[PDB]
Design a protein around this ligand. Structure first.
Ligand code: CA
Ligand code: CA
Ligand code: CA
Ligand code: CA
Ligand code: MN
Ligand code: MN
Ligand code: MN
Ligand code: MN
Ligand code: MN
Ligand code: MN
Ligand code: MN
Ligand code: MN
Lengths: 386, 386, 386, 386
């Protein structure tokens, strides 16, 4: 049951199943994976494609011949499996040069390098067919207040993204950017810490249409925020270009659990929203198989990502299609929420005694919203307890 | 020492010093205050002005004669003291009619009422000289996923704010709006939960220039965010129209402690930023004297708000003016953060071998940022330990 | 399906379904309920019993004749329905006299009053058949550091609980105490903030056997803790005398959602643990129907508490009984976790070369734990997706 | 000013100043330090001593000759400087063998190994003069519910600590154990997650007098708890055997900032408590110089730890000695908090009409606590603004 196929558009980063298990208190628990092997194993599980940071595919410091060979082998794996590469990104966080940032490093020479590194990989992303180029500015931020003037850093961040937009447009590329928020970790505070901050920033870029967000479940939950609500605001803005799916337990370090783990009900409401909104992008998993696992456990955890999406998709669809739930949604006035407040216009509102002098506030206040009955229908559907 | 005067522009809501101490587990511990008495007592402490929700000044349900009389008495107090009213707002949260929201209530008739209530108070705010009209949508949101379609609610929220902008423009008023984020409480999740989400939303209003944010220290800290960073992003966007100053200890219920309490170092960095940026708006306190206090303690806590601002202003100024700190800022490359990354242009960057093929990554990585020395200078200045 | 009956031992506080919906930003949205009516309505839903604070049953300030009459009517309702009263407690938080605490108020006369108030209600609890007397010290704590010397407050708290133990023993009562932790709200920080702190404190009481804990799902989750783990530690200590069941979304104000709402997977693991451990106490709900609801919604939300417990009980049982899961538990070495590390004794361990000089660390490190496969079996069982 | 000397008892782990800066998203930014060099540099800053994990001093896997040589060199550095070694600990977290735990690993052979590893290092700790042996069970816990039966794991944890107590007693050693709580990271949830849970656990060990806690500032703050309050409870229990000092900003990953950074007011109240209680143990820093720093910044950050302690010690002493503050403490009834509630005894309390029938609740409720004035005196003292 709940068997994924490539038509489900499930994608995985190389760095997900390839995570060796190092952590700040721990050494690797797994050997490195060849990207060719992860392409093959993901395909066999029913994935649609893979994504990469530059340095996941090509070791940092490679010669041009080494680079060609890594890319050749990867392309052969993609061709052998039918896997796609819908998204790529830059690693602007691992190398010590990026310890104060890439695009917002205090050192100008590092900012210029970060841009050159990114632009080299945009070209490769396009080679490989990617439609989206993600940017997670994990090193952009500070541990102390004097270290980083945030106005100046936002000026630098805008320059960087505007240069990248100039570049793609100069080359005639179709690729679009997706900025990935995170509130903290590895920096004490990261710039553009939530979906909202990233959306706001994009509106000040010179070509805003080229940029959207890549929200990650666990990242918004590291700020205690409602991930489905943030996704709804990104969809409302027309900016959900890509998404990272995983699990998180609240406010703590970035756990990157498999999707469905962590906050299960938020996963249900997320799937419900993506499906009802007709989101057409990749269902991408940015997760890490726990370091307790061997390779068999890596593949089990990846399979579980997809399985849980498909279970939740079935249950959300059944919820929305249930006449009893449709009834309950009307009883809770979700239909009224979707109608304009004052399509009659401002003057008409001002002249409507039913809106003020003759509004019976107590009668309106007495009306229950019937939200608990609706929510228990939702729970019953999620649990298969109807 | 650190004596405030009206020229410091310190303001207080009527509902701050007037908070009777009810909480969800507790009855009032203080009698209600007459607004006239709080105007007088605040003036005597050196405040510049006061702010109000409609229902703080005029009891809900008042007749026109009662309303005139409440306003008359308040105006006399303002005239007796020289206090100003720079901001007002609407109470769209206390009355049970607003239990599912004002502007985004599922019930359309409630949304229309909320707008009429607001517009009546805009007129009064303008009467009294207010430059800013705040909106805190504390009831906008949900406890469960099916109860609120956030796309539809954002459509309703945009209609509401666009109608308010149509109204002010129709009347020729100069007043501008400031949306106050909060992530949760009283709703399980509140819409526009952070500065970023509110900034993003404003960009989609029909007349965005009429709207900014009213960030509150404790609200961003309820999401674990860096309040000075969020203020910097609001300043970068040109949208810091007003601010609420108070204290909070992290991620928990909204504490509304006096300013300086809660996160003291964040208070220092906030003041440093407001002063270095030349923020010219009110320094408004949205706080609650703890319910342990009698009226003497109310006034002590209000005085402490202002005192702590003035202490932190002195220390931040001394930090920035210290030649030793100026030196340390250059050593940490804060000067370089403020210069353009690539004013030479994209092509020039692309053709600069110093940015890639001949960039010595290891040499750059070895350079320490010197942030800890800078931060300990900051600590020494804050503590008066230089 | 999932129909509760009194044999399931589900209990509710009067203050749960009777919550009028006041909050710190909001007035009541529901009328007060007569305890007689809530007894009747709960019984009809299949509840086993009810619990009370003194002031829920007898208005504060009642005369002896009024008190007798309130108790008479309540007893008639209990007799009419077959409902039980397994637990009672004291309200040491609503009245302004308790603004700095009951048992740890700085004012000694308040501490003495708090004790007298409690002892009066212990007598009534015993009258009504209660086996457990809960104490939630919601006002014990501080908003500022100088206000409360915690060593001195713990001395006062120990005196108070030791006096209560002297009292029950003097009267020959069988009732036992259960201390309910909470980390914050209404105080900035509450004393005994978690299960662990309360367990530790109990060990220093003069008659520790008389005292256990009453952990509440949402309270431990307000500190970001794992509620099932804390329950396991209370069970390990022999101290789970009572429990409060509800839902919470992480680190924020105390939400008191219906059980099953909030962290659904934690609810599953909680039920699994209570049932596998053979917890024999009440399954008590300390929840609040959201203030959006009318009375119909109150009863729906109460019914949902019980329904969700029963669904999760079925799924947890099925998980543990599945041979495939039993296999997976052995593959993950849960059997080995349950065997003694060194029943051979210290000397034997010291002389065992297999434990050190000849332990093959790499071979052991290579063994995967198989936890992800186990967890996806758990997920499949919870969702009814096997 | 604020110059530390060895008599201040400041200590540092080798792993603090020696942290190379690896993090889960980042490679090392600093070379490894020779322990000899850190001993020398710490001594020159005015430190009293150093602490170590086994694997900080002796590379994992060393031969007996290599081990002797590492220890010889370290002892020479200690002798050259007069530095002490008051505490040591075991690394039961870095090596992949410990991926599911040391003492509570599911694999029994790993649990036995963990014990042998610890016991070898206890012997060395004693060699070097240590009085305290810390245990931080960072790998004890789980990412999923089925992986770890917490009752069984606590049985294993108790066996392990009881075996260690048998060992020290068999050898006639004076050393005592200190269990270090942490709520999460690297495991999704860690067992014994707070001071309270560890204190409770200790009471169930066979020789409880041999065990205390080693609380860390940032760890309790990762659960949003009040660190000074938790320290007060550990002192009340007689169990503050050691402490880890650092800084943290709330609920997020373990930051390990220098002491004084993070929550500054909590640092002030902590110092106030340690000094007023006469804590006589090491003032140990478990911190990490941020990876932005070079070696000069490492030493600056270490110096700042000590400086901030000494500043806060001066300010706390001045607060407590100020007659004005002494007055304010009496006005807030801190004197009354320290007197017994009912030294007259239970019967006397029961017969005291002033405690109930003739207690004037309203008069008592009207009395303000004067906490805000007290707290602003505290703020003025901290800031040097008296
Ligand atoms: Ca889950
Ligand atoms: Ca403070
Ligand atoms: Ca749930
Ligand atoms: Ca600080
Ligand atoms: Mn992540
Ligand atoms: Mn991601
Ligand atoms: Mn607030
Ligand atoms: Mn506010
Ligand atoms: Mn609760
Ligand atoms: Mn409770
Ligand atoms: Mn730490
Ligand atoms: Mn530590």
């Amino acid at each position: 049951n709940y068997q994924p196929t490539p038509e489900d558009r499930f994608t995985f980063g190389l760095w997900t199943v390839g995570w060796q298990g190092r952590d700040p208190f721990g050494d690797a628990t797994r050997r490195a994976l060849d990207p060719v092997e992860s392409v093959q194993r993901l395909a066999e599980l029913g994935a649609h494609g893979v994504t990469f940071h530059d340095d996941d595919l090509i070791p940092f410091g490679s010669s041009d011949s080494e680079r060609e060979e890594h890319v050749k082998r990867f392309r052969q794996a993609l061709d052998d499996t039918g896997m796609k590469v819908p998204m790529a990104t830059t690693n602007l966080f691992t190398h010590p040069v990026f310890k104060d940032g890439g695009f917002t490093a205090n050192d100008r020479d590092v900012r210029r390098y970060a841009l050159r590194k990114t632009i080299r990989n945009i070209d490769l992303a396009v080679e490989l067919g990617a439609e989206t180029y993600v940017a997670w500015g994990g090193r952009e931020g500070a541990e102390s207040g004097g270290a980083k003037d945030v106005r100046d850093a936002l000026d630098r961040m805008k320059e960087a993204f505007d240069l990248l937009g100039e570049y793609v447009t100069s080359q005639g590329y179709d690729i679009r950017f997706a900025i990935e928020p995170k509130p903290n970790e590895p920096r004490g505070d990261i710039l553009l810490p939530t979906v909202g901050h990233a959306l706001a920033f994009i509106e000040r870029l010179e070509r805003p249409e080229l940029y959207g967000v890549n929200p990650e479940v666990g990242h918004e939950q590291m700020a205690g925020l409602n991930f489905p609500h943030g996704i709804a605001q990104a969809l409302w803005a027309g900016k959900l270009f890509h998404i990272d799916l995983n699990g998180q337990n609240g406010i703590k370090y970035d756990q990157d659990l498999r999707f469905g783990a962590g906050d299960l009900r938020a996963a249900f409401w997320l799937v419900d929203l993506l499906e009802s909104a007709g989101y057409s992008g990749p269902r991408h998993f940015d997760f890490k198989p726990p370091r307790t696992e061997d390779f068999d456990g890596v593949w089990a955890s990846a399979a579980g990502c997809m399985r849980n999406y498909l279970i939740l998709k079935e249950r959300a669809a059944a919820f929305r299609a249930d006449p009893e739930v449709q009834e309950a949604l009307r009883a809770s006035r979700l239909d009224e929420l979707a109608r304009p407040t004052a399509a009659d216009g401002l003057q008409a509102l001002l002249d409507d005694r039913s809106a003020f002098e003759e509004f019976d506030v107590d009668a309106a206040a007495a009306r229950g919203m019937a939200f608990e009955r609706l929510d228990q229908l939702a729970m019953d559907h999620l649990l298969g307890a109807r």
